[PDB]
Ligand binder design. Structure first.
Ligand SMILES: Nc1nc2c(ncn2[C@@H]2O[C@H](COP(=O)(O)OP(=O)(O)OP(=O)(O)O)[C@@H](O)[C@H]2O)c(=O)[nH]1
Ligand SMILES: Nc1nc2c(ncn2[C@@H]2O[C@H](COP(=O)(O)OP(=O)(O)O)[C@@H](O)[C@H]2O)c(=O)[nH]1
Ligand SMILES: COc1ccc(/N=N/c2cc(OC)c(OC)c(OC)c2)cc1O
Ligand SMILES: [Ca+2]
Ligand SMILES: [Mg+2]
Lengths: 426, 437, 155
């Protein structure tokens, strides 16, 4: 358990993936060339989890970039860190998908899944002890959603014992008012319930409400949204990139956070809420369990917590964190399931993120996440009842029975969250 | 002289075993390179410390210990630690992927591709012995390796060493220093499968050691270092009879004879006193009567339970230091009648006493202060059924909804084993009730 | 049949082909297998030019399909703001109810078309209109916690 292969698919995948490689490379002290310019150690003890050694004091990210649109090929290179990626990992097709989930999963995407799987091979053989895979993408589009889920199922066939972890971006009309996104998202959630071990549900709906209402951003841009995304991805992977004990196993995370195989959709949170260019222990533990700090548009006070994981970063008293965490579980004792004893894990890390002396990263498996799936299932039903734009998908091989099966599975997923939300122990 | 082989499984077994062997060398006067200057016989001997230490031709004293873990992170610290020269290099066996806190991975899948190698290395240590009497197995309850792999190893040793004894030092899970939510599961699974292959098991409640560090040692946030240092102090008091001269528990069979009245109820309760912080070097010296009184206080026990709830079946007192046998009998006679010490109807109602006149050894860097006399009480009481009741409750809270179960079934294990293990624990609690608790 | 070619012409947005067919007597109010008129498709696919020309040539602005969908239902669902105002200007029923009990205000609120929601309210959209599950447009904003949508419905 050590190496991790990162894959970013589509425009949103490469957009939020690039910001991930720019923030963590600064923490470990990595320049765009790949050299180590850090003044303190511990930045290279777990560096090989996300990087390799390319000879010459060089560290290259274990990243693979894929998008049907060749425009993203130039967008990544033009970035500040768009030169540390390897030219052998860029995989880009001819034409885009046009928000068609069928073009990513059955036609255009299938005509490129073998090109990506070949570079995942030479990357897997470079790993001494691979522990899993990582994928960033959105569910509203056609490439990152249609081809992303297909690539997940293909890598799983060749690596059945490896962990599949994804950072999925939920669609929202407040950021993108495209009416075919509820189609592609529903068809993707149907795939993520089966072929993934843990999915970080990042909701553009929640990201817009944080920038517009809490950060006073009248017209939030994708850079404003991705600032919160890059801050969350760095925190949820803190125990993977720095010592701080607690090992660094994706499977140990899944065993303790996923009580039922279909309920592997996590709700992330971050505190404090900072802007792009712009506390104490009782404050960090307070905002973490606040609905305004959740990266998914759900109120955790509407459901019950099955499992919870919190990561604190910076110099702080481990004794005081134990007091506040054990106390929050009492003021909100009715919001944790009683049939899972000791269902809250606390972790502290020495190195805080840049520009902040202290931080906190919340990872929750709450039943309140059904409010997110209820939102998309309603938009899916409103469009599917009128058969609107359904010929965009039936003309690419896919047929009508998959839309109903995808709809029947998400309502079953909501039924399972409500089932375990009302369960008592007695 | 009958050799004993120690086996350290998993992270908790390796780190505790590493602290026990450091303390063993300080008690026996053995240097980190294995040199024992006080050993007049070079190349061998019939001494009582040879049960734990073999001797090479160059006077090197190598422990009869095996370190096993499915991942190399913990054992690599032993290969680079202070005693990197002490242990046999081929007796530090490491895997590639750990059991991921899953009993099924440690027992059925991941643990099965190294069990044959561990047995061959254990065979090599047994071929050097002239009168092997048994094994000492250190492991945790909650870990995937400490529960899954240990239950597999104990099964194998019963077939390859059917006439030898097997003692356990188990780490009982505590919510303060727990690493997994499924640790109640793993603890029940390994207990059921090992209950038949274990002659005697000393459970170490991590919450007991945690509270002792906070109260007596003034350690605000006890770490694994603070816990294992106190645990190694108590483990040495238990195995001192095997390593030195004496007349109480001189071999592994006597442990089973004096402490285990019936095969299934082989979980003695250990109590240790006194525990004084190293910040007080001029503390008052507790008498024999005051340290013997402390053994009957539930705050000094290694497993959280109330012995006044249950009844005793056996009691052994192991003293260390300046202790006159006249004062023990006097201390016994008072703490025999001034307390509510109830023995069962079918026992001699007696206290076995063994005295070692060398004071306890403290390690440089530890939290304990030097004492002129200490005592470790080994008692088998039905009150220890409280530990099984607490563990079976958390097991039942999760298994009623089948939470986290799919992780175990997906690794070669069948869901029917969950029921068989819980049914066996219900019979164990009933075994303590048929005696009185 | 020129009506079938008129259905396909309004779908793809061919302004020239719609005029040639109407000049030869094509059925402007023709329907497909599910009852969709050329005005339904032009409003569905956002062809504002065809929508206006059809309305100038006897197209029923309130025609329903087999599922009771009016051209305003589809324009509000897909989110064509310019088409919605033109339909309302030609006598479209802002409170038309389809077979599922939904109104044009329901579909615009569900899909998050806040601009259309504001336009429909100023033309007399019934905020008390319940669907086949008792839900109104305001109930939809509260069930999913749409604060931007809830404030609009409290004008
Ligand atoms: N007293 C003490 N307990 C420990 C120590 N290390 C781990 N534990 C306990 O062991 C339990 C988990 O078992 P581990 O030994 O860590 O896991 P493992 O045996 O290596 O098996 P894996 O799951 O494969 O890692 C936890 O409840 C810890 O409290 C230690 O150094 N001292
Ligand atoms: N948070 C966030 N969301 C994005 C970003 N870029 C695109 N999206 C979302 O992704 C959806 C479009 O899918 P996209 O990934 O661009 O299509 P693809 O190129 O086929 O993968 C839209 O609903 C956007 O809201 C980004 O940089 N950040
Ligand atoms: C309900 O109880 C528990 C919940 C979560 C627990 N551990 N969680 C982690 C989290 C991690 O990163 C976020 C890890 O880093 C990747 C991680 O590596 C081992 C573990 C532990 C629990 O006992
Ligand atoms: Ca000798
Ligand atoms: Mg381990």
């Amino acid at each position: 358990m050590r190496e991790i292969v990162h894959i970013q698919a589509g425009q949103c995948g490469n957009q939020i993936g690039a910001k991930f490689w720019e923030v963590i490379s600064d923490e470990h002290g990595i320049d765009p060339t790949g050299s180590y310019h850090g003044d303190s150690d511990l930045q290279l003890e777990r560096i090989n989890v996300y990087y390799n050694e390319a000879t010459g004091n060089k560290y290259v990210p274990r990243a693979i970039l894929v998008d049907l649109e060749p425009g993203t090929m130039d967008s990544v290179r033009s970035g500040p860190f768009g030169q540390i990626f390897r030219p052998d990992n860029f995989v880009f097709g001819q034409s885009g998908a046009g928000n068609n989930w069928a073009k990513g999963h059955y036609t255009e995407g299938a005509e490129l899944v073998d090109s990506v799987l070949d570079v995942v091979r030479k990357e897997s053989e470079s790993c001494d002890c691979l522990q899993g895979f990582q994928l960033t993408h959105s569910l509203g589009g056609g490439t990152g959603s249609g081809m992303g889920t297909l690539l997940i199922s293909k890598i799983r066939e060749e690596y059945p014992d490896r962990i599949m972890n994804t950072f999925s971006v939920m669609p929202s009309p407040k950021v993108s008012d495209t009416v075919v996104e509820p189609y592609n998202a529903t068809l993707s959630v149907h795939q993520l319930v089966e072929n993934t071990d843990e999915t970080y549900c990042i909701d553009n709906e929640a990201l817009y409400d944080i920038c517009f209402r809490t950060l006073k951003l009248t017209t939030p841009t994708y850079g404003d949204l991705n600032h919160l995304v890059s801050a969350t991805m760095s925190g949820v992977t803190t125990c993977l990139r720095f010592p701080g004990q607690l090992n660094a196993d994706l499977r140990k995370l899944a065993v303790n956070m996923v009580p039922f195989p279909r309920l592997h959709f996590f709700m992330p949170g971050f505190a404090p809420l900072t802007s792009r260019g712009s506390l104490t222990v009782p404050e960090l533990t307070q905002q973490m369990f606040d609905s305004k700090n959740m990266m998914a548009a759900c109120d955790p006070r509407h459901g019950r917590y099955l499992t919870v994981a919190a990561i604190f970063r910076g110099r702080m008293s481990m004794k005081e964190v134990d007091e506040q965490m054990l106390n929050v579980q009492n003021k909100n004792s009715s919001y944790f399931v009683e049939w899972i004893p000791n269902n809250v894990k606390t972790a502290v890390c020495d190195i805080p993120p840049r520009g902040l002396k202290m931080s906190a990263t919340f990872i929750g498996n709450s039943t309140a996440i059904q409010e997110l799936f209820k939102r998309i299932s309603e938009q899916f039903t409103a469009m599917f009842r009128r058969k609107a734009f359904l010929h965009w998908y039936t003309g690419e091989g896919m047929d009508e029975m998959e839309f109903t099966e995808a709809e029947s599975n998400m309502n079953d997923l909501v039924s399972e969250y409500q089932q375990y939300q009302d369960a008592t122990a007695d | 002289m009958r050799e004993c082989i120690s086996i350290h499984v998993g992270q908790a077994g390796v780190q505790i075993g590493n602290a026990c062997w450091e303390l063993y060398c300080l008690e026996h006067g053995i240097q980190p390179d294995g040199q024992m200057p006080s050993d007049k016989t070079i190349g061998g001997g019939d001494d009582s410390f040879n049960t734990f230490f073999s001797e090479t031709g160059a006077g090197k004293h190598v422990p009869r210990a095996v370190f096993v873990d499915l991942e190399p992170t913990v054992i690599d610290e032993v290969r680079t630690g202070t005693y990197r020269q002490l242990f046999h290099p081929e007796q530090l066996i490491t895997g590639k992927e750990d059991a991921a806190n899953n009993y099924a991975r440690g027992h059925y899948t991941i643990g099965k591709e190294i069990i044959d190698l561990v047995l061959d290395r254990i065979r090599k240590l047994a071929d050097q012995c002239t009168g092997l009497q048994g094994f000492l197995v250190f492991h945790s309850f909650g870990g995937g390796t400490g529960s899954g792999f240990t239950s597999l190893l104990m099964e194998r040793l019963s077939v390859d060493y059917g006439k030898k004894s097997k003692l356990e030092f188990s780490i009982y899970p505590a919510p303060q220093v727990s690493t997994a939510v499924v640790e109640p599961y793993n603890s029940i699974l390994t207990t059921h499968t090992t209950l038949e292959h274990s002659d005697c098991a000393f459970m170490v409640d991590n919450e007991a050691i945690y509270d002792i560090c906070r109260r007596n040692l003034d350690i605000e946030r006890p770490t694994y270092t603070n816990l294992n240092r106190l645990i190694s102090q108590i483990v040495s008091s238990i195995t001192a009879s095997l390593r030195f001269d004496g007349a109480l528990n001189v071999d592994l069979t006597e442990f089973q004879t004096n402490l285990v009245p019936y095969p299934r109820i082989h979980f003695p309760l250990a109590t240790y006193a006194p525990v004084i912080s190293a910040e007080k070097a001029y503390h008052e010296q507790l008498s024999v009567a005051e340290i013997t009184n402390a053994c009957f206080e539930p705050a000094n026990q290694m497993v959280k339970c109330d012995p006044r709830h249950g009844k005793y079946m056996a009691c052994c007192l192991l003293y260390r230091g300046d202790v006159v046998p006249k004062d023990v009998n006097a201390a016994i006679a008072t703490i025999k009648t001034k307390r509510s010490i109830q023995f069962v109807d079918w026992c001699p109602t007696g206290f076995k006493v063994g005295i070692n006149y060398q004071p306890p050894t403290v390690v440089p860097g530890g939290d304990l202060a030097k004492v002129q006399r200490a005592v470790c009480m080994l008692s088998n009481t039905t009150a220890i059924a409280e530990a099984w009741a607490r563990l079976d409750h958390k097991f039942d809270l999760m298994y009623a909804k089948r939470a986290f179960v799919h992780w175990y079934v997906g690794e070669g294990m069948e869901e029917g084993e969950f029921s068989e293990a819980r049914e066996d624990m219900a019979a164990l609690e009933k075994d303590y009730e048929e005696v009185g608790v | 049949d020129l009506g079938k070619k008129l259905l396909e012409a309004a779908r793809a947005g061919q302004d020239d082909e719609v005029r040639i067919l109407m000049a030869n007597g094509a059925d402007v109010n023709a329907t497909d297998a599910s009852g969709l008129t050329p005005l339904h498709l032009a409003a569905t696919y956002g062809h504002l030019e065809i929508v206006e020309v059809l309305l100038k040539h006897g197209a029923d602005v309130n025609a329903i399909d087999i599922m009771g969908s009016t051209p305003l239902h589809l324009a509000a669902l897909i989110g064509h703001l310019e088409i919605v105002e033109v339909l309302l200007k030609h006598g479209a029923d802002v409170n038309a109810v389809d077979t599922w009990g939904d109104t044009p205000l329901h579909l615009a609120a569900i899909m998050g078309h806040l601009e259309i929601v504001e336009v429909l309210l100023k033309h007399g959209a019934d905020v008390n209109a319940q669907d086949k599950f008792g839900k109104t447009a305001f109930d939809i904003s509260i069930d999913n916690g749409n604060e931007d949508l809830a404030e609009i419905l409290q004008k």
